Subunit: 397 residues, 5 copies
């Protein structure tokens, strides 16, 4: 024939084709759409809004009973490319859609002589799923993509898998693995959904399992916390008499509060439940408050010298003997002169006695400060070891 | 017939069909559109802009008097799928629209032999409603969706419900319940709206009632507040003489002010009215200011020792007797020597008297500090109990 | 006739209709477009960018001389609905456009037998206007919407009002009154604009007058300011000798500076002129600086005791008499003993004299501190009363 | 003729017209497009991304040799409106495009009997240019708009100006002058651009010169700076012995650092070069650091009294004579008594000598503090005067 | 011929042309698309999301075997412009697409008599690549653009380069060089990609190498750091007895922590690895912590005077001899009088001895403070020199 083979075949196919008619000679035969999903990247995970944005390479093929031809009559053409906007295309969508992502339009599809139509197209899908951040930053999310025909029931359109389920499960060839999220697998699952008495719908659920990389968050959260805790430990060495100890502790607490406020404003959160990491921040705040309370108690005990109250005997024993051991620690004119110089005696006696009372109070305060510093340091060490053990469990288990 | 049944039926229907003509043989008969609304998710609630963004699964069916056929003449076809862009579609819109949401296009609709046309399509609707945050974070919003034909009057297009009102009221099958907002119900209501003398319009109002989950806000707001209040309580134990008490209190107040500024910058607000939660922040600020004023008063009273003024007798009685009980608390040369050593007497007398005056002032200040600390602690406890009772009322009522 | 009346009428009208031809039999006759504007909501007012975003319900009608028919020939059809995309539509736009808002498309328009065409459509219009914030937060903005035919001159398209000007002026039926902005009126005004010698253009200017609700801003700005001013007033009671007064004042000033920086970063501003509210912040900062300067002066005066300089007589009189009244306030060995004990006399004399000089300086400083505190309190009260009077004028005038 | 003149003319013109053919009878004749640009507003200037967003009223006219008619044959019609989407339109674009702005579509164009086609359309153009902020906030930007035919070479499409260059240069009729940027002029310039051997392209470059209004930035930057500098000046009056001077200075420096960090986070910047205004901030920081260093030096000099080191004679002379002038400032028992009371002599001697050494050190420190305060105040005054002179030069030159 | 040459040629070409058929007479012959890429600007580099946004001037040409004509039959027309939407266009896309950028549409393409079709069009491409910020701010990114036919295999569409690889490699004519990123080169590379047994795909990978300009980041990060380090150095001069040293150091540390938090919130970061610049911030924080620990140790050593413990002999030797050298530093009544005045002796003895013990402790503390200040200054100088050497290596290597 004079005309080119491709042109003649396209004229033979599309001159009598109806775009709005489902391609089945017998209307009782459903149109089976075999789909495949390849996850490319996790563009954004919005735990606040429970919205997942991901980019996939979606492809589907079905049988077009009207687009069939004999290759021998068209120069042995067995495969042909036809515009997408000139043939019937199933209305396969995702139930979890909450927004329309902007994706490039694929103008052509492949068609084979026996009727198979191959449609490859990438999709930016904005889907809402359950983003539980209880184990944040070690959370593993399980978001599902439910591909289903929005209108046509299973008696018209049914859905199946292009490849074997195992291959889809472990398909990670083109995934952007350098991002915050690691793709564990894509689990397919078929279900015949229904709400009406006979309106049964075909669904293919792809469970996109993604695991967060916690090292960035672990650093950005722990490092300031351990720095402030170390500074708190160092602050104990300041003598209680200097007075700068209270200012140091309160300034450190203010800095920690500012840091925690910033962290809360920056970290993700969900209204249904708070992450477990927030408990550790509360524990650190409690430790800092305990340190400041101990500092205030020691300061008050030292200033009790201003009470002019001799140290009780029982406290003396308890602190300086038990705890200290535990811590490994003209005659008439002359007689008038005598009487007055004894008044001087009595006044200097009183001043020296006040000084010695302050001495005793200060010694007791220092001993108790050493004891409480040791106790607080041991508690902090135990808490740090417990946290490290939890991290090791999450790391190696 | 040689041609496929679906192709022949589509040709028989759409070859003479006019897309821009309302499908009624008699123009006096209105076209009744039975709609249904299923709320899927509350994407965003903007109290600042009074804008609500939600995703719904909207579906409507009407009768197309031109798209009727006899099944026996088309291989017993009783249901057919036809492209949406090839048939008349009512211009049902929402009055509350302030923006166009991006929603996937459904290319096909279902058509039955007797003329019924079924159109399923999801809609991201950006609607403006009254978001009163007076009871924030326990606010229950009542936003209405008014589906109405923008142009056609009731003499042309009328609207009704697909399902019974009760089923629509309690339809929560696919709602995303893990979000910040909980769906209480969707109340439908029909109204024949009108502004002109004869331009009566059909309206179907769906009242989307959503309740906020307050636990997240409750925690994020109370926990810093109770932490700072506890720190304020601890600060009372600092002795007034140390001087660090004033610095502690002012630093705590500065931290609370910064926290409140951040909270205001982060919490939602409306220009028509402030939330009731802002009163509790003002109460906490007043409590902190009262604490600082008491600290300043005690500091001034203690420093009154620098006034060299003996304590008044009435104040002495009132504080050290009533309140304290309530709180369960060569001759000529020798005579010259005598005269001078008595001058020494008088100077040490004066110094000791000054010290004793300071003693009395300090004792009075300490007693009053204990009293005011007890009073402030009782007031704080009462306020906390009242707040807890209010929360319990909001929780169990 | 066998065919339906609506179908026959649509065929009779649109089969010979040209969409791109202005509908006038005589080209010398202009096409008069009667428009109407109903403001629905003020979505956003951007004082920084001088951009106004509002949602309106715009509707226009004109006469289509080609779309005329005799009702008696079409089953007494006097009103018909025709797709918008099948008839000529005027290119009415707003000159103030700076952006294209996304608005739902209305597919149908109403047509009557005598030629009138009714087009209802909502519009999200992003327009630039003069947003003067001089009276912020009590500013009343006056933004104009100039509807005009972009291309056609007045010899082709002319514009008029659908309703009477009074009704348009007071049309507030569907306005969202719960927002930050209150709609005072929509004033229409017609003008025959021109730039060329004969290119006269029809314009219809709608002056959208909106008034801001200041209560939210009034609270969010005054409450921190009055709180900090009250704290400054309380700080005067701290004795100058404690030394904590300077730290208190400087910390308060730092907090106020941080608050003012945040307020400036959050409040709207224009490069052409600053709001009058900024003057009051400067006044408050000046008051705080004056308070700190007075505190520093009193501290220096008290520490002048370290100068070992007796108080000048004139200052003594002025402060302790005038101002205080205003404020309602072996012989040789024995003689050697005598000589030395008189050396002791002289040393204790000097120490006591130094103490008394410090006494006098402290008394003078305290009296002057009381005076300056009274003066500053009176000035603050006067400023607050003036501000309250200004607010009352803005409220009741 | 029975048909309307406009309808008949449109049928005569557009029935044989090809939309995709350049309108020239002789293909060797280029199509000359006369353009005009009117700047309406400067929507956004992004110095960070080097992106300029502006709104212009662009209009162009060319000759359509196929759309010609004799007015006498069509009821003396000399001007006609035709849809834009039905005639050939040149592909004039801007080379500097980096984004597509959303602009309203103009559906109609004017056509005259001799072939001229007038196309008016507004354009929101997002263009990238060189935004040098070296003279910020007094920077004058010079951004170019290069209108050129993307595909057609000069042998097909050539570009010229609608109006005279002078009129375009001074066209400021509709510019929004209330914004941050002031339009100085729009300079046109034609160039025959080329890269290949014969692919010469016509370009029309419009140089949009815009000048920033600096008053807002000048205030928002200077006022905090001068306030903090004044506070630093006041801080010198605090006596060095009080100890609050160091806390005051360090708190002021912390506040200035926070302010500078916020300013840097808010002010625009470019990676190619920093603005000159940053030098003045560095100078202010250096001044504050010098003030704090002087305060620390004076504090150390005063505390040298704790060194028990008498003031060197040379320092005494230099400070208290030169600089001070510049600043305008039983026998055995009795002998035992004698020996011991002389031991008392020696101890009180030592205490008084220590006090006098502290006296001398304090006097020297006070004199040097006065000197350095005068020097620092003079330096600050000189810097402020220099800055004011620079501002006056930028204002009046 | 009467008709215009261009019109006649367009009619001859496009009247029988099929838009959806690949232009090859023999379907076995692949369509070779020669592409070219010119990078215009780097709009945005998102290290957080691993997304690159760039603007390129993409152009491709291929052979259209159906659009061929003899110039002599059409008035010697050798080149023609035809609308893009009227001819077959290959579906060349970028694999790395994650979003659709908005780019102007080019309506026309050039066609030559022998069949070559030239298509010029700009593209805003949003592509995901590996943005390693390990060497930040001196990082050199290597992002690839893989142009490939999405559907057609290599047996249908193959891709080649328009120009020589060297010219494409060094094409920087129109690049916006004033931005944050500098373009080093664009390296092309061809690959026959494949996943199936016979589905081989043609790919052309352009490696866009961009280098960041670090001067802005270098300044904005170092200048605050060096300022705070200098302030820390100055703080050592404060005497330990003043007590303001601890407050100064803790305030400086708080300021540095706030600065570091802001820097972290502003600087880019990746979850796969932290930048090396973060180590230097940790080193600076460690230096500040060491300085504060030294200050606390010196303060405690000085306050040890409150321990009433004479300085150990070994410490005395070590500090005041070795280190100091290294640093280049009636009888009965009279006898009663005697006994009591000797009691006075003993009390003043004790007071003076306490004073001398404090003297010794203070001298030791001052000497050790000088030593540790010298050591810390030397360490800081060494660290600064090492950092400067690293910068010089990065600058000149
Ligand atoms: C428009 O439709 C509504 C809903 O079907 C009609 O309202 C119903 O009218 C019937 C008959 O009068 C009543 O029995 C129902 O109780 C009504 N339902 C409701 C919810 O009001 C309405 O009459 C229709 N109007 C027109 C003009 O057709
Ligand atoms: C364009 O329309 C306006 C509005 O209808 C016309 O203005 C009116 O003109 C009539 C007759 O001259 C007056 O009686 C009215 O008072 C005018 N109204 C206003 C608001 O000005 C205007 O004349 C029309 N112009 C043309 C050229 O048709």
């Amino acid at each position: 024939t004079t005309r080119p083979a491709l042109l003649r075949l396209s004229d033979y196919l599309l001159t009598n084709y109806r775009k709005g008619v489902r391609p089945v000679r017998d209307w009782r035969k459903p149109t089976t759409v075999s789909i495949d999903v390849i996850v490319y990247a996790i563009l954004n995970v919005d735990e606040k809004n429970q919205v997942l944005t991901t980019y996939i390479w979606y492809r589907q093929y079905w049988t077009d009973e009207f687009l069939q031809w004999n290759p021998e009559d068209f120069d042995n053409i067995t495969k042909l490319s036809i515009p997408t906007d000139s043939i019937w295309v199933p209305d396969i969508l995702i139930n979890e859609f909450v927004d329309v992502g902007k994706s490039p339009n694929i103008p052509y599809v492949y068609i084979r002589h026996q009727g198979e139509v191959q449609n490859y197209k990438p999709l930016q899908v904005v889907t809402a799923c359950s983003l539980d951040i209880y184990n944040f930053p070690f959370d593993v999310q399980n978001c599902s993509l439910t591909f289903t025909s929005w209108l046509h029931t299973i008696q018209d359109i049914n859905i199946s898998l292009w490849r074997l389920p195992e291959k889809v499960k472990s398909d990670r060839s083109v995934f952007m693995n350098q991002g915050e999220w690691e793709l564990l697998g894509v689990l397919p699952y078929f279900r015949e959904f229904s709400m009406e008495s006979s309106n049964y719908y075909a669904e293919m659920k792809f469970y996109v399992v993604i695991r967060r990389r916690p090292l960035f968050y672990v650093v950005s959260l722990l490092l300031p916390s351990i720095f402030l805790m170390v500074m708190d430990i160092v602050g104990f060495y300041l003598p209680p008499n200097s007075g700068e100890r209270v200012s140091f502790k309160i300034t450190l607490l203010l800095g920690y509060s500012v840091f925690l406020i910033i962290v809360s404003d920056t970290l993700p959160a969900t209204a249904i439940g708070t992450p477990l990491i927030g408990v550790y921040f509360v524990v650190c705040m409690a430790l800092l408050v305990i340190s400041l309370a101990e500092t205030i108690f020691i300061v008050r005990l030292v200033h009790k010298q201003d009470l002019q109250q001799p140290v009780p005997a029982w406290l003396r024993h308890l602190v300086l003997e038990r705890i200290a051991w535990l811590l490994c620690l003209a005659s008439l004119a002359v007689c008038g002169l005598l009487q007055e110089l004894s008044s001087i005696r009595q006044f200097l006696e009183k001043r020296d006695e006040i000084r010695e009372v302050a001495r005793d109070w200060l010694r007791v305060g220092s001993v108790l400060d050493k004891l409480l510093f040791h106790i607080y340091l041991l508690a902090v060490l135990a808490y740090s070891i417990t946290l490290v053990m939890l991290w090791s469990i999450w790391q190696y288990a």
